[PDB]
Design an enzyme around this catalytic site. Structure first.
Site, PDB file in Angstrom:
ATOM      1  CG  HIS B  41      -0.546   0.162   2.505  1.00  0.00           C
ATOM      2  ND1 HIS B  41      -0.175   1.389   3.021  1.00  0.00           N
ATOM      3  CD2 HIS B  41      -0.472  -0.764   3.484  1.00  0.00           C
ATOM      4  CE1 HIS B  41       0.159   1.162   4.282  1.00  0.00           C
ATOM      5  NE2 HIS B  41      -0.006  -0.120   4.605  1.00  0.00           N
ATOM      6  N   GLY B 143       2.340   5.931  10.213  1.00  0.00           N
ATOM      7  CA  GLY B 143       3.748   5.869   9.839  1.00  0.00           C
ATOM      8  C   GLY B 143       4.456   4.611  10.313  1.00  0.00           C
ATOM      9  CB  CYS B 145       2.498   0.886   7.449  1.00  0.00           C
ATOM     10  SG  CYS B 145       0.834   1.365   7.972  1.00  0.00           S
TER      11      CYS B 145
END
Ligand SMILES: O=C1C[C@@H](C(=O)Nc2cncc3ccccc23)c2cc(Cl)ccc2N1
Ligand SMILES: O=C1C[C@@H](C(=O)Nc2cncc3ccccc23)c2cc(Cl)ccc2N1
Ligand SMILES: [Cl-]
Ligand SMILES: [Cl-]
Ligand SMILES: [Cl-]
Lengths: 305, 301
Positions: B41, B143, B145
């Site tokens: 993503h 942030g 991820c």
């Protein structure tokens, strides 16, 4: 979202852990620049521990009596000296992985990360608080002596604890990196006991603010209190006194959640007098006191190292 | 003595954390050998996230659209491919700090350490477990991820989790390092909810054995139970069923303490019925389920 007991990343400290062997005793050492720091009891046999004269035991040792192993490499000891309850072994090689560091002595209530080690090899990392009775509720087995406690401020590791012993209640005692014990303890196999422990009030309040930040508000109430009435109540429940310094320190969390510090104190007073009534706060049925106000801000803002 | 929730030392993983940027999106990547692994993503805008067609979004990207920063050094992306929900960015430098590693897919109940990261920089380390509903109760902000979950055995890092998203209840969802999600989750902003969570029974029993090893016996009783009667009672408190596999797994702890597994199951049934009556077990007023039988043996005497 979420709130966990979180330790600092241990990498900077892992690159400093070595094994120190003197005779039959093997424990951990902290290799910084060209010095290996370790508990002075590494020179003791189990019999010596009963009543050791460390100056006398140390004077009989030569540099070659100390075997220092860094990974699968032997460090040659070129000098040795004692500073309080820490032994300093001068080695011929500066640790190339030495981080920017400082030795700091912490106060009860302050938290730090412990890198538990066995035979100079890191086994685990956990976060804990220096209890008001100067012990730490650590998790340590035989061979863990010399494991260190630290905090990281920017890119600087502040070493604040070195593990020395376990008290009969299963709690732990140690020194700062200058070899001064935290608490009324001595490095000797003798009858020693921790004093009655108290709860770190400013830390409980910080954790209540963390619960509010994470969406838990059931414990909030319309009430406020005075610092003097709160301390009278808190003393009754073996809670540490809350000072105006603690109130100031909680200022940012108070502003972020809109809950004044004495407003949160009124929540805490009610929790002490009435309990949680089957409810939990951040998944806990007890009031948690091992997160400082700084820890809460750091975790709820994502500060990195 | 003592029993703490203990994470693995994070050093071997810290030397793998990098920052990955694609346009305006910035998240974390795991740099092992000459490949950076990150959530796919990273190629999405907030708009794309409702129904992204990752193959279509990815085909429009070139190597130079991905900015990979390792410390204060920019790595050159020389290739890119997608494997399930993970993006693999081939780089022109092998990570000199790459430890001995493996990718392992874990089962619910398994524990692991999380190295929470922001902008390729490690912020903290904590221990958690893959819940029975396949979520993790992590502590993650925007942030985070690309932050990873791992275990270390001997000197080998077994990477088992990569963080992808936060569900509306505040719990987290992610994938193994092959990009396969844990649970019925998708990397989309579509309405998703975790199934009702249950307590990891085998882990609670392991932690009761840890308490006995550490000298606490107040909760033991003179009773035993059949496995089926235990499960009938356990399910009523939203406890996961205890299988014969779990009973076998608890064998070593049973032998070390002299308390048969079904004898410890009877203590657990009694604790669920009575609560703790003001007492604690290993400093906790709740039954702890994020220590596996393996964790207890590793930590305890
Ligand atoms: O038996 C001892 C050894 C040592 C000590 O406490 N070591 C340990 C440290 N931590 C957790 C332990 C668990 C289990 C056994 C030992 C453990 C010690 C050091 C000093 Cl300074 C004074 C007395 C002692 N007595
Ligand atoms: O808003 C989003 C962004 C991202 C996500 O969940 N990020 C986060 C991850 N972890 C903790 C967060 C805390 C606070 C905000 C965001 C967080 C995402 C990724 C995916 Cl695959 C699908 C949907 C989303 N939705
Ligand atoms: Cl309480
Ligand atoms: Cl602050
Ligand atoms: Cl597993």
């Amino acid at each position: 979202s979420g709130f966990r007991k979180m330790a600092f990343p241990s990498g900077k400290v892992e690159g400093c852990m070595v094994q120190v062997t003197c005779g039959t005793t093997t424990l951990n050492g902290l290799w910084l620049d060209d010095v290996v720091y370790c508990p002075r009891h590494v020179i003791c046999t189990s019999e010596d521990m009963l009543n050791p004269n460390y100056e006398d035991l140390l004077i009989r040792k030569s540099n070659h009596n100390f075997l220092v192993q860094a990974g699968n490499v032997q460090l040659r000891v070129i000098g040795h000296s004692m500073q309080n309850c820490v032994l300093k072994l001068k080695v011929d090689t500066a640790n190339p992985k030495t981080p920017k560091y400082k030795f700091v002595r912490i106060q009860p209530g302050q938290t730090f990360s412990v890198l538990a080690c066995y035979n100079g090899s890191p086994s685990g990392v956990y976060q804990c608080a220096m209890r008001p009775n100067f012990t730490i509720k650590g998790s340590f087995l035989n061979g863990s002596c010399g494991s260190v406690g630290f905090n990281i401020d920017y890119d600087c590791v502040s070493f604040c604890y070195m593990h020395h012993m376990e008290l009969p209640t299963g709690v732990h005692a140690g020194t700062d990196l200058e070899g001064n014990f935290y608490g009324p303890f001595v490095d000797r196999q003798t009858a020693q006991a921790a004093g009655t422990d108290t709860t770190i009030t400013v830390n409980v309040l910080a954790w209540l603010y963390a619960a509010v930040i994470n969406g838990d508000r059931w414990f909030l109430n319309r009430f406020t209190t005075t610092l003097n009435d709160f301390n009278l109540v808190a003393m009754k429940y073996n809670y540490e006194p809350l000072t105006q310094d603690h109130v100031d320190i909680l200022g940012p969390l108070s502003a972020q959640t809109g809950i004044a510090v004495l407003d949160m104190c009124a929540s805490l007073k009610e929790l002490l007098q009435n309990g949680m009534n089957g409810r939990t706060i951040l998944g806990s049925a007890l009031l948690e006191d091992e997160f400082t106000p700084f820890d809460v801000v750091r975790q709820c803002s994502g500060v990195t190292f």
